[PDB]
Tab-separated table of C-alpha atoms in Angstrom:
chain	number	residue	atom	x	y	z
A	1	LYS	CA	-35.597	17.153	-4.366
A	2	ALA	CA	-38.131	16.078	-1.779
A	3	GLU	CA	-36.899	12.765	-2.906
A	4	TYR	CA	-33.310	13.408	-1.546
A	5	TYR	CA	-34.286	14.301	1.910
A	6	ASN	CA	-36.957	11.432	1.742
A	7	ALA	CA	-34.048	8.832	1.434
A	8	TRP	CA	-32.092	11.027	3.594
A	9	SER	CA	-34.276	10.689	6.372
A	10	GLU	CA	-35.023	7.210	5.969
A	11	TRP	CA	-31.678	6.379	6.125
A	12	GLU	CA	-30.892	7.711	9.351
A	13	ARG	CA	-33.699	6.641	10.325
A	14	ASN	CA	-32.204	2.839	10.082
A	15	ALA	CA	-29.275	3.721	12.569
A	16	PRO	CA	-28.216	0.696	14.359
A	17	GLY	CA	-28.541	1.149	18.017
A	18	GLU	CA	-23.276	6.172	14.431
A	19	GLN	CA	-23.885	9.860	13.728
A	20	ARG	CA	-26.213	9.612	10.855
A	21	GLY	CA	-28.270	12.619	11.691
A	22	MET	CA	-24.996	15.339	11.376
A	23	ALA	CA	-24.237	13.589	8.027
A	24	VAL	CA	-27.742	14.123	6.863
A	25	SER	CA	-27.339	17.992	8.287
A	26	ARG	CA	-24.092	18.269	6.035
A	27	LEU	CA	-26.356	16.636	3.043
A	28	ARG	CA	-28.679	19.310	3.216
A	29	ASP	CA	-26.646	22.045	4.222
A	30	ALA	CA	-24.267	21.122	0.679
A	31	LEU	CA	-27.872	20.510	-1.477
A	32	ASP	CA	-28.823	23.738	-0.709
A	33	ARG	CA	-25.408	25.848	-0.752
A	34	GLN	CA	-24.761	23.982	-3.483
A	35	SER	CA	-21.140	23.245	-1.811
A	36	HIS	CA	-18.499	21.716	-3.595
A	37	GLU	CA	-16.796	20.273	-0.343
A	38	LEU	CA	-18.693	17.002	1.417
A	39	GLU	CA	-17.378	16.085	4.688
A	40	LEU	CA	-18.708	13.273	6.645
A	41	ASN	CA	-15.270	12.491	8.722
A	42	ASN	CA	-15.571	10.450	11.551
A	43	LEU	CA	-19.138	9.944	11.948
A	44	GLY	CA	-19.042	5.817	12.521
A	45	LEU	CA	-21.078	5.488	9.183
A	46	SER	CA	-22.098	2.128	8.553
A	47	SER	CA	-24.214	2.951	5.014
A	48	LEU	CA	-23.997	5.268	2.817
A	49	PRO	CA	-27.689	6.589	1.500
A	50	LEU	CA	-24.967	16.193	-5.810
A	51	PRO	CA	-23.560	17.510	-9.115
A	52	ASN	CA	-20.985	19.680	-7.606
A	53	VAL	CA	-19.632	18.117	-5.147
A	54	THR	CA	-15.612	17.544	-6.108
A	55	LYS	CA	-14.232	16.484	-3.048
A	56	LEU	CA	-15.580	13.445	-0.535
A	57	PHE	CA	-14.496	12.996	2.592
A	58	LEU	CA	-14.916	9.684	4.393
A	59	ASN	CA	-12.450	8.796	6.499
A	60	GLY	CA	-12.911	7.479	9.789
A	61	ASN	CA	-16.246	5.434	8.890
A	62	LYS	CA	-16.954	1.784	9.029
A	63	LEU	CA	-18.040	1.761	4.762
A	64	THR	CA	-18.418	-1.730	3.426
A	65	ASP	CA	-20.196	-0.832	0.171
A	66	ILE	CA	-19.671	2.146	-1.941
A	67	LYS	CA	-21.977	1.609	-4.341
A	68	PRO	CA	-23.816	4.716	-3.601
A	69	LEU	CA	-20.754	6.629	-5.026
A	70	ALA	CA	-20.286	5.318	-8.582
A	71	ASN	CA	-22.152	7.874	-10.558
A	72	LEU	CA	-20.467	11.003	-8.662
A	73	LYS	CA	-18.872	11.426	-11.881
A	74	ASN	CA	-17.776	14.704	-10.648
A	75	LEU	CA	-15.594	13.581	-7.979
A	76	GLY	CA	-11.705	14.732	-8.129
A	77	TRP	CA	-10.657	14.138	-4.805
A	78	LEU	CA	-12.177	11.044	-2.861
A	79	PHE	CA	-11.327	9.966	0.966
A	80	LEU	CA	-11.570	6.498	2.570
A	81	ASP	CA	-9.324	5.936	5.382
A	82	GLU	CA	-10.071	3.718	8.078
A	83	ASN	CA	-12.942	2.041	6.230
A	84	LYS	CA	-13.674	-1.594	5.252
A	85	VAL	CA	-13.728	-1.243	1.778
A	86	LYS	CA	-13.100	-4.976	0.146
A	87	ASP	CA	-14.628	-4.105	-3.699
A	88	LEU	CA	-13.093	-1.657	-5.756
A	89	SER	CA	-15.159	-2.024	-9.073
A	90	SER	CA	-17.818	0.629	-8.069
A	91	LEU	CA	-14.825	3.429	-9.036
A	92	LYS	CA	-14.781	2.178	-12.459
A	93	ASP	CA	-16.800	5.360	-14.083
A	94	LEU	CA	-15.043	8.423	-11.659
A	95	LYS	CA	-13.138	9.385	-14.448
A	96	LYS	CA	-12.224	12.736	-13.109
A	97	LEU	CA	-10.575	11.349	-9.592
A	98	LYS	CA	-7.012	12.320	-9.315
A	99	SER	CA	-6.208	11.971	-5.562
A	100	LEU	CA	-7.757	8.228	-3.911
A	101	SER	CA	-6.680	7.173	-0.078
A	102	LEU	CA	-8.274	3.924	0.838
A	103	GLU	CA	-5.252	3.372	3.737
A	104	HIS	CA	-6.058	1.486	6.430
A	105	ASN	CA	-8.860	-0.574	5.005
A	106	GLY	CA	-7.898	-4.303	5.064
A	107	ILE	CA	-8.123	-4.351	1.391
A	108	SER	CA	-6.172	-7.147	-0.377
A	109	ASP	CA	-7.554	-7.064	-4.421
A	110	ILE	CA	-7.041	-3.834	-6.344
A	111	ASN	CA	-7.940	-4.998	-9.695
A	112	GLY	CA	-10.738	-2.528	-9.626
A	113	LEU	CA	-8.122	0.431	-9.668
A	114	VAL	CA	-7.051	-0.550	-13.087
A	115	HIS	CA	-10.192	1.524	-14.203
A	116	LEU	CA	-8.260	4.764	-12.709
A	117	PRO	CA	-5.391	5.554	-15.238
A	118	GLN	CA	-5.980	9.066	-15.020
A	119	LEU	CA	-4.974	8.609	-10.962
A	120	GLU	CA	-2.043	11.197	-9.705
A	121	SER	CA	-1.681	10.100	-6.117
A	122	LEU	CA	-3.009	6.941	-4.862
A	123	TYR	CA	-2.639	6.438	-0.781
A	124	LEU	CA	-2.882	2.373	0.313
A	125	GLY	CA	-0.732	2.259	2.683
A	126	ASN	CA	-1.601	-0.643	5.909
A	127	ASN	CA	-3.768	-2.993	3.659
A	128	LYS	CA	-3.259	-6.564	2.887
A	129	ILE	CA	-2.354	-5.909	-0.680
A	130	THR	CA	0.171	-8.659	-2.416
A	131	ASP	CA	-0.442	-8.458	-5.891
A	132	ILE	CA	-0.076	-4.731	-7.551
A	133	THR	CA	0.063	-5.501	-11.431
A	134	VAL	CA	-2.765	-3.538	-12.569
A	135	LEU	CA	-0.615	-0.849	-10.956
A	136	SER	CA	1.184	-0.596	-14.121
A	137	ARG	CA	-1.611	0.581	-16.084
A	138	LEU	CA	-1.247	3.726	-13.409
A	139	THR	CA	1.127	6.056	-15.545
A	140	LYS	CA	0.045	9.267	-14.603
A	141	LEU	CA	1.086	9.023	-10.370
A	142	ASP	CA	2.989	11.028	-9.007
A	143	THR	CA	2.401	9.581	-5.297
A	144	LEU	CA	2.281	5.877	-4.595
A	145	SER	CA	1.795	4.846	-1.148
A	146	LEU	CA	1.968	1.222	-0.502
A	147	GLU	CA	3.519	1.171	3.138
A	148	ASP	CA	2.449	-1.948	5.025
A	149	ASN	CA	1.171	-4.246	2.916
A	150	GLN	CA	2.660	-7.759	2.197
A	151	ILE	CA	3.981	-6.947	-1.395
A	152	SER	CA	7.076	-9.187	-3.078
A	153	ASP	CA	6.716	-8.335	-6.716
A	154	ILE	CA	7.364	-4.479	-7.164
A	155	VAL	CA	8.289	-4.969	-11.323
A	156	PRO	CA	4.634	-3.969	-11.942
A	157	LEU	CA	6.177	-0.151	-11.161
A	158	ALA	CA	9.502	0.120	-13.074
A	159	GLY	CA	7.285	1.750	-15.646
A	160	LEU	CA	5.719	4.476	-13.497
A	161	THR	CA	8.003	7.029	-14.427
A	162	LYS	CA	6.485	9.681	-13.375
A	163	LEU	CA	6.783	8.745	-9.825
A	164	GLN	CA	7.989	11.380	-7.349
A	165	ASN	CA	6.962	10.070	-3.925
A	166	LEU	CA	7.403	6.364	-3.373
A	167	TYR	CA	6.716	4.347	-0.121
A	168	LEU	CA	7.015	0.769	0.369
A	169	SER	CA	8.726	0.475	3.766
A	170	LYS	CA	6.897	-2.288	5.868
A	171	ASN	CA	6.578	-4.932	2.754
A	172	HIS	CA	8.392	-8.038	2.043
A	173	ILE	CA	10.977	-6.563	-0.631
A	174	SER	CA	14.272	-7.869	-1.388
A	175	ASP	CA	14.617	-6.887	-5.103
A	176	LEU	CA	15.173	-3.391	-5.903
A	177	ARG	CA	15.963	-4.111	-9.871
A	178	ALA	CA	12.365	-2.886	-10.592
A	179	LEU	CA	13.244	0.854	-9.507
A	180	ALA	CA	16.155	1.766	-11.502
A	181	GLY	CA	14.560	3.771	-13.672
A	182	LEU	CA	12.601	5.624	-11.881
A	183	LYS	CA	14.420	8.598	-12.266
A	184	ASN	CA	12.329	11.201	-11.085
A	185	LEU	CA	11.923	9.921	-7.514
A	186	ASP	CA	11.884	12.960	-4.768
A	187	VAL	CA	10.664	10.899	-1.315
A	188	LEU	CA	11.745	7.046	-1.568
A	189	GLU	CA	11.023	5.054	1.753
A	190	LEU	CA	11.851	0.891	1.864
A	191	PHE	CA	12.949	0.462	5.479
A	192	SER	CA	11.552	-2.454	7.545
A	193	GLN	CA	11.222	-5.224	4.960
A	194	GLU	CA	10.698	-8.772	5.869
A	195	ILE	CA	11.435	-11.526	3.911
A	196	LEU	CA	10.440	-14.769	4.719
A	197	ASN	CA	12.081	-18.003	2.633
A	198	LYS	CA	10.510	-21.588	2.099
A	199	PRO	CA	11.520	-24.023	4.575
A	200	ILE	CA	15.126	-25.835	3.974
A	201	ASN	CA	16.659	-29.018	6.311
A	202	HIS	CA	18.810	-28.147	8.893
A	203	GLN	CA	22.358	-28.981	8.199
A	204	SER	CA	25.652	-28.900	10.314
A	205	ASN	CA	26.774	-26.302	7.713
A	206	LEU	CA	24.503	-24.756	6.097
A	207	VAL	CA	24.369	-22.213	3.003
A	208	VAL	CA	22.233	-19.686	2.438
A	209	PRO	CA	22.049	-17.873	-0.773
A	210	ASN	CA	21.452	-14.410	-0.277
A	211	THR	CA	18.791	-13.015	-2.249
A	212	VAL	CA	18.389	-9.510	-1.342
A	213	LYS	CA	19.604	-7.240	-4.557
A	214	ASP	CA	20.109	-3.594	-4.895
A	215	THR	CA	18.869	-1.392	-8.234
A	216	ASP	CA	21.622	-2.286	-10.197
A	217	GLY	CA	21.017	-6.033	-9.048
A	218	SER	CA	23.951	-6.476	-6.856
A	219	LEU	CA	23.562	-8.683	-4.007
A	220	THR	CA	23.558	-6.569	-0.919
A	221	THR	CA	26.140	-7.379	1.617
A	222	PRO	CA	24.563	-8.734	5.519
A	223	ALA	CA	25.320	-5.970	8.472
A	224	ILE	CA	23.551	-8.873	11.222
A	225	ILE	CA	23.945	-12.676	10.910
A	226	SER	CA	22.724	-14.381	13.241
A	227	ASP	CA	24.078	-17.894	15.248
A	228	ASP	CA	27.084	-16.217	14.470
A	229	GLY	CA	26.734	-16.837	10.604
A	230	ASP	CA	29.000	-15.511	8.015
A	231	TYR	CA	28.924	-13.679	4.469
A	232	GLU	CA	30.977	-15.229	1.991
A	233	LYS	CA	29.399	-13.420	-1.487
A	234	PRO	CA	26.894	-15.145	-2.465
A	235	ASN	CA	26.528	-17.389	0.441
A	236	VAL	CA	25.224	-16.957	4.451
A	237	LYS	CA	27.114	-19.602	6.012
A	238	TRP	CA	26.461	-20.818	9.230
A	239	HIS	CA	27.666	-23.704	11.754
A	240	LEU	CA	24.995	-25.403	13.072
A	241	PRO	CA	25.681	-28.722	15.162
A	242	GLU	CA	22.208	-28.190	17.043
A	243	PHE	CA	19.300	-28.090	15.504
A	244	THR	CA	17.741	-24.829	15.940
A	245	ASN	CA	14.073	-23.759	14.141
A	246	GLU	CA	15.438	-20.638	12.568
A	247	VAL	CA	18.359	-18.474	11.653
A	248	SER	CA	17.888	-14.562	9.969
A	249	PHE	CA	20.264	-12.254	8.519
A	250	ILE	CA	19.546	-8.253	8.524
A	251	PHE	CA	20.534	-6.515	5.980
A	252	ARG	CA	20.943	-1.875	5.837
A	253	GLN	CA	21.796	-0.270	2.554
A	254	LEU	CA	21.699	3.045	1.216
A	255	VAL	CA	19.924	3.593	-2.246
A	256	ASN	CA	19.810	7.133	-4.752
A	257	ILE	CA	17.476	6.370	-7.618
A	258	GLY	CA	16.862	9.396	-9.043
A	259	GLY	CA	16.449	12.793	-6.575
A	260	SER	CA	15.814	10.456	-4.032
A	261	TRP	CA	17.954	8.645	-1.447
A	262	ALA	CA	16.506	5.883	0.879
A	263	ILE	CA	17.496	3.284	3.441
A	264	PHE	CA	16.731	-0.219	2.181
A	265	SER	CA	16.915	-2.085	5.578
A	266	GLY	CA	15.344	-5.354	6.335
A	267	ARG	CA	15.404	-9.365	7.370
A	268	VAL	CA	15.709	-12.123	6.064
A	269	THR	CA	14.233	-15.223	7.880
A	270	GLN	CA	15.415	-18.713	6.718
A	271	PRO	CA	13.283	-21.843	8.554
A	272	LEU	CA	14.373	-24.944	9.412
A	273	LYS	CA	13.733	-28.497	10.342
A	274	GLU	CA	14.027	-31.707	11.164
């Protein structure tokens, strides 16, 4: 009991020249009243110093180390938006966790999340994620937000049949074939994809195969083509008598998956050399 207040005061005294005093006050109130909710939102905390706490609010801080949360096995809801958390293996034993929010954290390695197969909602919007392989194990998710990342391979999502809300806008998605089986979807977002092809040699008669495919595998007909190019399936064609550094084309197609209807929109950019 006394060791808890001692550790909290020692943590507060180590604040750099951050509202650690308010954090200590809230910790004392939660420990005294045996509260199940701990709200430490927007305290600028750069570090961290309760068996009944089930919801932990930590949005709006500067946390990089989440080791002090490793033994909070009663946690059901954990919010860590706008932090700087990069390692997630510290949550491997939070087997009661149902909801997890890690938006605006700049995270690229989400492999540790393979240790939370019971998760029901997962928010990873606005990060640096490319590989979502381990997400294939989270077969109990009904909400998954992956918007504003660098994801190009969404095949790991093909078996997550329980999904009802899926946010995939602002990524590098060009192939929706992996989503064809998610017939339980209610909300789906797929707009503003940015696809970058490998650089190819410039030609006066430039021919670029279209690679944008819908959920049926059919090529998406481009909506706009730069440099007066045209489309004759499967090829986008340009006449470039003078060299230019890049061409591009923008696509926009309505897609229906389950009970969800979404605009699959984006832009493919083709760099040219020589």
